């Protein structure tokens, strides 16, 4: 036949907020819907990320607490430390961020001390509001992991006295779709990915395919390892 197509990955159409369109141009006329489904189902379930897993505010003992001059309660601050999109580097795997101010306005996500390796993606994410001038300090802990599901999870052991546990959403992908187009003797797979910002579309989709191939590679031998 000599009609062996092997698809190549591309990044047509960078659109929207954090929305893109990956594309796999030469596909072998039947194998495209399989790849669309496997990509959509592995992106939305197996990708790893980083998030805040524990916080320690200074003059605060528990979560059902309150600070002076601050317009929020700790239950509402720990709720904003969940929308902070962080981007770790290669082999850190764990670290403690630090925040400390003495201003009199909206504290933001941009106010974390500049650690190397960390990078906050959404910088105008409100964290707290100080209505009068005062000193506001907290230490968030960042970790890597994936959404392993509700029951099985990590209990997030606490060490100091004011430690509060935050439950993280590690996956960076928010919404996937796909489509398949006809070319004649080949087809075009077209993926739509929407991320939070801490990963790029090509790297994401090739990580998905790496996972899927490592899964498929057990049926080529019918052997355990």
């Amino acid at each position: 036949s000599k009609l062996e197509f092997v698809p190549n990955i591309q990044l047509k159409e960078d659109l929207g907020a954090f929305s893109y369109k990956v594309q796999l141009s030469p596909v072998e006329k039947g194998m495209a819907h399989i790849l669309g489904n496997s990509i959509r189902r592995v992106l939305l379930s197996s990708l790893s990320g980083a998030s805040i897993i524990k916080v320690n505010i200074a003059n605060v003992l528990h979560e059902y607490s309150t600070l002076e001059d601050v317009k929020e309660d700790v239950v509402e601050i720990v709720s904003n430390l969940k929308k902070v999109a962080i981007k770790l580097d290669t082999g850190i795997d764990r670290l403690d961020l630090e925040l400390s101010v003495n201003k009199s306005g909206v504290v933001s996500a941009g106010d974390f001390k500049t650690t190397q390796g960390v990078e906050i993606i959404n910088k105008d994410q409100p964290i707290a509001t100080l209505t009068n001038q005062r000193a506001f300090s907290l230490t968030a802990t960042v970790s890597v992991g994936r959404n392993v599901g509700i029951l099985s999870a990590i209990p997030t052991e606490l060490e100091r006295v004011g430690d509060i546990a935050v439950d993280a959403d590690f996956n960076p992908i928010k919404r996937v779709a796909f489509e398949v187009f006809d070319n004649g003797d080949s087809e075009t797979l077209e993926v739509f990915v929407k991320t939070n910002g801490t990963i790029e579309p090509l790297a994401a989709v090739t990580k998905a395919l790496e996972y899927f191939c490592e899964q498929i590679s057990v049926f080529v031998s019918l052997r355990v390892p």
């Binding site: 059902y64 309150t66 600070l67 002076e68 001059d69 601050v70 317009k71 929020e72 309660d73 239950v75 509402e76 709720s79 209505t131 009068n132």
Partner: protein
């Protein structure tokens, strides 16, 4: 027969961590939340002087209001136990500098 039990079942609804309006409503959720004493209501025309999650201090505009104290202080309920073991909690809406009226939440 079903309205009977749809009315009876929204008196058993546990309130949630973060509240959220109905997108389809009747125009009566405001009346039921106001004609109970859970929302804080301003008694005088003023403008917010200080705010946190424990109190609110209004600065009464005395030219259009009565001979009031020149200052209204409203204190806020925070993590209070309910008859059903649930949680009652008040959160401020206003910002320092806002022009409020009589009746406003």
């Amino acid at each position: 027969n079903r309205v009977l039990m749809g009315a009876n079942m929204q008196r058993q609804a546990v309130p949630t961590l973060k509240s959220e309006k109905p997108l389809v409503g009747t125009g009566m959720e405001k009346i039921v939340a106001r004609d109970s004493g859970n929302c804080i209501i301003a008694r005088n025309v003023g403008e917010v002087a200080e705010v946190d999650s424990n109190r609110i201090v209004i600065k009464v505009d005395t030219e259009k209001s009565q001979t009031s104290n020149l200052v209204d202080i409203y204190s806020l309920t925070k993590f209070k136990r309910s008859n059903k073991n649930t949680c009652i909690n008040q959160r401020p809406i206003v910002n320092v500098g806002d022009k409020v009226e009589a009746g406003d939440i």
